[PDB]
Design a protein around this ligand. Structure first.
Ligand SMILES: [Zn+2]
Lengths: 84, 49, 48, 48
DNA sequence: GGATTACACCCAAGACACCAGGCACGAGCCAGAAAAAAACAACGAAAACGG
RNA sequence: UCGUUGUUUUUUUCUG
């Protein structure tokens, strides 16, 4: 009802800056409090650096739920959004 | 954290920062409400749960 | 000096009124520009 | 007179800036702090 | 020309627009700092004094 | 023996 099927998803496919910041904050918070790390780490200790490194690889298990003005919403997986 | 600062923070769209800066770094609080009348008259005794 | 002293306050008041007028307009995903109620102001922000 | 007096204190305790009528005061002479006065103004709750 | 059908019309009654005064509000930037000041009149007890 | 609290109210002269 409220959800929109994957085939007719119309919103912009790119990743808005605000989505970028929210995703980075959430991931860093999760990692920084004993969460699994989906990608290898070489020498970087900061959770937030780890977060951007993970994003750059498109390896984030987060689904953005975009609310349209009416109330209907569509969902995008972070794996499928074109990041600048 | 005057009004104009609130508006500037909105401008950048830093929602969560604004939320916490007005709750956590300031007078936060917790309450209880009744889901029927929607008032704040609940008589809560935590140690008596 | 008097001119600056008077002008600052009135400009500040105008600023406050403007901000408290347009503080809820938000560019929605559809490309429309709607205030809190969902009323549409512009069908495309700046028409571009 | 007594019931009008009671009405007067009730009204003042609810608001102390009624137009065209004198203003309730403390023995200090300072006007009272009615709830409406508390809420309004920059110092009030909303803006304070 | 009295009688007879035909009607002219108008004027007081009543509904309404509105009305310009008056009459109220009611507002009049931001953050920060320091020192300096803040009720009392009368009353009946109750220790007080010389009688 | 952790714990451990410090006024309001106005007015004033100032700072950017
Ligand atoms: Zn209830």
């Amino acid at each position: 009802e409220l959800a929109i099927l994957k085939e007719e998803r119309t919103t912009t496919p790119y990743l808005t800056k605000y989505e970028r910041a929210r995703i980075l904050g959430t991931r860093a918070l999760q990692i920084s409090m004993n969460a699994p790390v989906l990608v290898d780490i070489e020498g970087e200790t900061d959770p937030l650096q780890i977060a951007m490194k993970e994003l750059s690889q498109r390896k984030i298990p987060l689904v953005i739920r975009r609310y349209l003005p009416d109330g209907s919403y569509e969902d995008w997986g972070c794996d499928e959004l074109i990041v600048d | 954290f005057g009004e104009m600062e609130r508006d500037c923070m909105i401008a950048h769209g830093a929602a969560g920062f604004l939320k916490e800066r007005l709750m956590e770094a300031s007078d936060a609080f917790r309450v209880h409400v009744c889901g029927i009348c929607g008032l704040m008259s609940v008589i809560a005794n935590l140690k008596k749960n | 000096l008097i001119d600056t002293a008077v002008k600052t306050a009135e400009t500040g008041y105008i600023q406050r009124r403007l901000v408290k007028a347009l503080e809820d307009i938000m560019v929605h995903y559809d490309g429309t520009t709607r205030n809190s109620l969902g009323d549409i102001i512009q069908f495309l922000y700046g028409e571009d | 007179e007594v019931e009008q007096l009671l009405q007067f204190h009730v009204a003042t305790y609810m608001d102390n800036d009624i137009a065209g009528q004198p203003q309730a005061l403390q023995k200090s002479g300072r006007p009272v702090k009615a709830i409406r006065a508390r809420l309004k103004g920059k110092e009030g709750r909303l803006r304070g």
